[PDB]
Ligand binder design. Structure first.
Ligand SMILES: *[B@@]1([O])O[C]([C]C([O])=O)[C][C][C]1[N]C(=O)[C]C1=[C][C]=[C]S1
Length: 473
């Protein structure tokens, strides 16, 4: 069988991400090798193998009319072995993958196994498109990924992990208009060109497989349900005093407890679990579940990355009050960073969900209106206030632009620090999620740990895409 040329993977602008490299596999007709034993030591040397074990191997398989000697030698090493002119030694031309961006886009692109077959990421997901048929060559695949945004994201997430002594992290950037993933980076990462002795830990595409309680980052969807109910406007007040609320044996507790009356923007700025719980009791869990289901939290992303986790959105016929509250302030559900980014992309795109893509989108599919454009517009303004208002997430602010977003912190006393947002706030182009796992320095809150990463990556990302500054006189 004639091994086919595996199709080129590029970024959205044709930068090479995975290239088929010529290599040499050497096989032997032992029957013919057994006629030239005096050549074996020179041949053993040229293969790196020991003289004795090489000789043991060939003697044992002297019946077989075929065995492999070595796979995936460089052509140069291959020519050296052919230059020995040993009877019973023949060469096949094979293809191994090289990844020029290396660790920068490891998780997204993935890699091939020993047989030039997709084992991780896009290599696995689009294996049939890229492989061709062993012989017709495989087809070029242009990713949605912008290598320029990917490098910035990679660099800033790495610097955030080190500055906070964190064990892991994820950053996803999405085009809100096209459903395209512009960047997807995880720490820790690995060099896919050197897979000799490296942990399955480093190879985990956390953005797509790590499921977590999103906490306060889904309070905006609870608020979308509130504004869509006809019962709530942004200027309405909730009494959250004294920052706790008993629901049978369950006690809802706010992290900050020096508030009485908050307006709905204030509930988001303070991330008040009591405030959102009381709104949830009024509107019913069904309306909150429905919005979260529709923006894709705990739902199949359709990206068909094998080992992709879907997480869980809990459902009930009759919602108990405790489950109603915990859903509303973002516990009792499990999501991935890609789902959260996708949910924020729909909010940012005036309530319209466009299907997620890891490949360059030339013809944008029709979106689903999952939140009414007026509710989406209102929730955008409130999330702009969360970043810009007194006591807000000022570290999320993006010089030259109106940014909008929401911090989160969950307990796993280890913590998960989250920031999800989009910019520019008036004409959203980009949604971003930053997840940092177990920050080990003093500040562990989303607004302290993850928000500065959002600021710098978003600042860079908007400039690389030549988005015009929207904070003018
Ligand atoms: B929410 O996930 O995040 C808020 C903080 C933020 O926005 O970064 C606080 C309320 C929510 N988190 C919790 O109630 C869980 C915590 C327990 C102790 C500290 S965070």
């Amino acid at each position: 069988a004639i091994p086919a040329h595996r199709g080129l993977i590029t970024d959205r602008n044709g930068e090479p991400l995975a290239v088929s490299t010529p290599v040499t596999t050497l096989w032997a007709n032992p029957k013919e090798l057994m006629t030239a034993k005096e050549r074996w030591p020179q041949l053993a040397a040229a293969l790196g193998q020991d003289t004795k074990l090489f000789a043991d191997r060939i003697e044992q398989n002297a019946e077989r009319e075929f065995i492999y000697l070595v796979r995936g030698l460089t052509p140069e090493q291959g020519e050296g072995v052919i230059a020995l002119k040993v009877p019973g030694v023949y060469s096949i031309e094979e293809f191994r993958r090289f990844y020029p961006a290396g660790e920068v886009v490891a998780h997204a692109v993935g890699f091939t196994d020993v047989d030039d077959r997709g084992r991780e990421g896009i290599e696995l997901a689009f294996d049939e498109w890229l492989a061709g048929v062993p012989a017709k060559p495989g087809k070029t695949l242009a990713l949605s990924i912008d290598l320029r945004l990917q490098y910035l994201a990679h660099r800033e997430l790495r610097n955030a992990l080190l500055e906070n002594g964190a064990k892991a992290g994820s950053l996803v950037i999405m085009d809100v208009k096209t459903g395209e993933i512009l960047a997807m980076t995880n720490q820790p990462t690995y060099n896919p060109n050197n897979r000799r002795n490296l942990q399955p830990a480093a190879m985990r595409n956390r953005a797509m497989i790590d499921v977590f309680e999103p906490g306060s980052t889904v309070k905006p969807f609870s608020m979308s349900a509130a504004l869509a109910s006809g019962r709530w406007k942004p200027s309405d007040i909730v009494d959250v005093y004294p920052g706790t609320l008993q629901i049978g044996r369950y006690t809802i507790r706010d992290v900050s407890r020096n508030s009485r009356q908050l307006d709905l923007t204030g509930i988001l700025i303070k991330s008040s679990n009591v405030g959102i719980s009381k709104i949830a009791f009024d509107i019913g869990a069904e309306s909150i579940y429905s919005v979260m289901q529709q923006v894709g939290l705990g739902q199949d992303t359709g990206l068909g990355f094998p080992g992709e986790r879907v997480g869980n959105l809990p459902n009930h016929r009759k919602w108990p009050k405790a489950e109603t509250a915990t859903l509303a302030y973002g516990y009792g559900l499990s999501v991935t960073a890609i789902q959260l980014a996708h949910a924020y992309a729909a909010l940012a795109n005036d309530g319209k969900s466009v299907p997620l893509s890891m490949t360059r989108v030339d013809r944008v599919p029709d979106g689903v209106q999952v939140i009414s454009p007026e509710v989406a517009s209102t929730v955008q303004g409130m999330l702009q206030q969360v970043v810009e208002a007194q006591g807000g997430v000022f570290r999320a602010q993006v010089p030259g632009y109106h940014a909008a977003g929401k911090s989160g912190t969950a307990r796993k006393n280890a913590y998960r620090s989250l920031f999800a947002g989009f910019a520019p706030a008036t004409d959203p182009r980009i949604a971003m999620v930053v997840v940092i796992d177990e920050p080990s320095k003093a500040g562990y809150f989303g607004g302290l740990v993850s928000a500065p990463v959002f600021s710098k990556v978003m600042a860079g990302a908007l400039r690389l895409m030549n988005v015009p500054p929207d904070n003018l006189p």
